[PDB]
Amino acid sequence: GGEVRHLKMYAEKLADGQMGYGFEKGKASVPGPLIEVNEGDTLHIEFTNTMDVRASLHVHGLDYEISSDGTAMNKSDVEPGGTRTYTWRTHKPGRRDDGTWRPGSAGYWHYHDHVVGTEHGTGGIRNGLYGPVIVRRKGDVLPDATHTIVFNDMTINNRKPHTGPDFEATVGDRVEIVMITHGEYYHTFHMHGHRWADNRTGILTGPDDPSRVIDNKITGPADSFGFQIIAGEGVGAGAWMYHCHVQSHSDMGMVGLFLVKKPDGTIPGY
Amino acid sequence: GGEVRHLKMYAEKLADGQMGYGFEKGKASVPGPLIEVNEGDTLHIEFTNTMDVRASLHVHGLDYEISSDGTAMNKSDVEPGGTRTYTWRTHKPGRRDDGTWRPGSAGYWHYHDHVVGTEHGTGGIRNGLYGPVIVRRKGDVLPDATHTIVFNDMTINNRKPHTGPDFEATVGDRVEIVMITHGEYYHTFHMHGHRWADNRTGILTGPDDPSRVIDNKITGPADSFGFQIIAGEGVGAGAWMYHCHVQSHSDMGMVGLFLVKKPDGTIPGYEP
Amino acid sequence: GGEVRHLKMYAEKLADGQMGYGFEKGKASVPGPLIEVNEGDTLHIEFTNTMDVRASLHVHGLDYEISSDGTAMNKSDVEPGGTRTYTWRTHKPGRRDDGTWRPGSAGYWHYHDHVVGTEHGTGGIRNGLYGPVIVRRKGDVLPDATHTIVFNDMTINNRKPHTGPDFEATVGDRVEIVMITHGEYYHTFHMHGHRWADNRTGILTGPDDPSRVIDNKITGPADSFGFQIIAGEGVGAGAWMYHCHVQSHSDMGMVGLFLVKKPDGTIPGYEP
Numbered sequence A: 001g002g003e004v005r006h007l008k009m010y011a012e013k014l015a016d017g018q019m020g021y022g023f024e025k026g027k028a029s030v031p032g033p034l035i036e037v038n039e040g041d042t043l044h045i046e047f048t049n050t051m052d053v054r055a056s057l058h059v060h061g062l063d064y065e066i067s068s069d070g071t072a073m074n075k076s077d078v079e080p081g082g083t084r085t086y087t088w089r090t091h092k093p094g095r096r097d098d099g100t101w102r103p104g105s106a107g108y109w110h111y112h113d114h115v116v117g118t119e120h121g122t123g124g125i126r127n128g129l130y131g132p133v134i135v136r137r138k139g140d141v142l143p144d145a146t147h148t149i150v151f152n153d154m155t156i157n158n159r160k161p162h163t164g165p166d167f168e169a170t171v172g173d174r175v176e177i178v179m180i181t182h183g184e185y186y187h188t189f190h191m192h193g194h195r196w197a198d199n200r201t202g203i204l205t206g207p208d209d210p211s212r213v214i215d216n217k218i219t220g221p222a223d224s225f226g227f228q229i230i231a232g233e234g235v236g237a238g239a240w241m242y243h244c245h246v247q248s249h250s251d252m253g254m255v256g257l258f259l260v261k262k263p264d265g266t267i268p269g270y
Numbered sequence B, C: 001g002g003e004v005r006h007l008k009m010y011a012e013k014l015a016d017g018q019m020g021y022g023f024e025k026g027k028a029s030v031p032g033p034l035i036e037v038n039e040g041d042t043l044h045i046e047f048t049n050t051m052d053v054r055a056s057l058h059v060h061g062l063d064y065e066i067s068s069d070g071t072a073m074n075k076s077d078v079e080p081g082g083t084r085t086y087t088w089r090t091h092k093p094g095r096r097d098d099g100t101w102r103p104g105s106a107g108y109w110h111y112h113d114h115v116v117g118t119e120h121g122t123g124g125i126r127n128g129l130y131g132p133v134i135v136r137r138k139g140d141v142l143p144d145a146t147h148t149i150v151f152n153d154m155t156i157n158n159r160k161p162h163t164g165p166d167f168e169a170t171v172g173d174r175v176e177i178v179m180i181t182h183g184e185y186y187h188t189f190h191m192h193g194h195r196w197a198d199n200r201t202g203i204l205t206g207p208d209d210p211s212r213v214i215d216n217k218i219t220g221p222a223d224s225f226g227f228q229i230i231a232g233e234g235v236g237a238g239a240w241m242y243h244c245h246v247q248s249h250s251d252m253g254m255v256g257l258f259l260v261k262k263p264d265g266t267i268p269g270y271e272p
Ligand SMILES: [Cu+2]
Pocket: A114, B192, B241, B243
């Protein structure tokens, strides 16, 4: 509100047929790196496609002009080997001249390829071309740690079945989760031991906020949400599961651990 | 809040095998026409089934008595060539005698057949017997235009894959979308370049509204929601896609264009 | 709150192959029995597994320590014939020392098995090991009756197709529905003639609550919500259907009746 940030991104081929984004060449990951801005910021992303097929960057939520939408149709993708600057903007909330209220960009969002495999990025998303974006409102509560969980088709973060990811915290830590879904299937995200408000920030504003407090939520492709929890609050340390609650999904491997440790670094049991 | 209104409606079979509603014989559409009323209004719909099978009209949201629920079970459907008057009412919100708060009928709702093909209208809905209904609250912000997008099985508005529909606006217009899902599948509605509040009106009341601002929403059969956006607000003119984000669905043709024009009528990339 | 309460619970196998919980050996139901507490109450449940496989109780929403999470991994399940005391707590909302607002446990929750069939309770849930939990906030409005509707795979309350369940009320009654989904499938819960708020309690706090008012809602495995309605308000008596609105699901039997009676005990169309 409002810095003009410059940033580079690269799409790259990875082991085992995966593809991923990174801020630095040679350092792509699945999921892609978190991009975090404040409302009012502008972001110029100089994106380079280092792969042998056309590729792009498409973002949810943020204000971009049509030349930055990442589609073939608007000639907004990038040749093998090529480079292009995308521009994303964000805006603060406020009253319009007509007296109505402009929302503001703040929320939990995401970016992904829109052109690998099909004109809807089906091959790209499947291979790992997705990552999270957070836009903070002035005065939002900031966490001690942020974790990204993406349910992509039947995987978490494109991992093999039953291999996490796992995430560590300590009783009392303010932990932020960004939850994105991609692919063909619906899922239900569930965490043991912890709960959040079903609203923008995942936190209740005060006693007048009527939002449902939940610990389970249905999600479908390209849905994103986020929340903050206090690790172990009222429940203590432990190896706390998170998983998809669709029964065959969890049985086939969509399960991870939210390892909450005591101040001395132990977990009771595990 | 409240006028009594009278309105005629027809169910017709269409030459290609589909079925639609219309306010006039020979002017059936899919989706059926938009009905819009204020909280407190009553609506007497004189409905005529011009088809050779039994048909009905079932509405979500609004106050109807069991005789107007449109089901076979309640003797509420209509024989071939027959006519029946359905009555829908709406109420304003207010404090009840017990001190609790009665909601009010305002919202984005819909009507569809409940009897063609099966006793839950499976055949009717499939063929196109569905349409939108809006109930406004006093002081609601009104749009310039209202458009209806229905995901019905793997189609938008019962159209062939990759054939829209497309909508048009000029940068700055207040556009209202009513979004309905029907059939067997879950979908995920997404618009490029635009976003809305996940609450009743699609708009935030002011800075105290904690509702999520979104551009992508999961929906299932018979879900309806609506919102208003300012076309191109902060993003400018363009051929802005909307589509289902379930990857196979968009690949197989659930895609459309929201064409936002510069005040000179052009769209960046596509000069006429 | 806070009251400390003690409760006994049992898991039994049933002659048809199903499994259920109950407060008394020989009185297992599917859904299992309602447990209702106030925010701040602690609950000690003496759970005895009477089956020949290991079994557990896992709860959503409430505060439990890892030793009561009901999973194999944290050694929290129970051997055939064994007994174990689970402890569930609830807390009231309030300001934390960091000035942020702690939610409170109030809501519509549920409990289920986590170890029968697989280590996610797949077999247990399928067979019927599930039931509702309600946590009330001080000042919450209390209903006349609470009913539990659980869409478990393609069944309501594990029942055979087209066999309800049917609930009964009189025009004017304050009815509470707790709606839970389990299994592999998504559904959309729909009620004729009635509507509620998509928030914590299902009721609007007053005119500043921008929550969508709905009559249809998409749900997936382990989702729970609840609401209150005034039976027949603005619509009168009738055989009001509720069903899953996914067309093949209702056609194959996920249908029930909410029977709202006149003060003389009758339903329009179906007098005895
Ligand atoms: Cu797209």
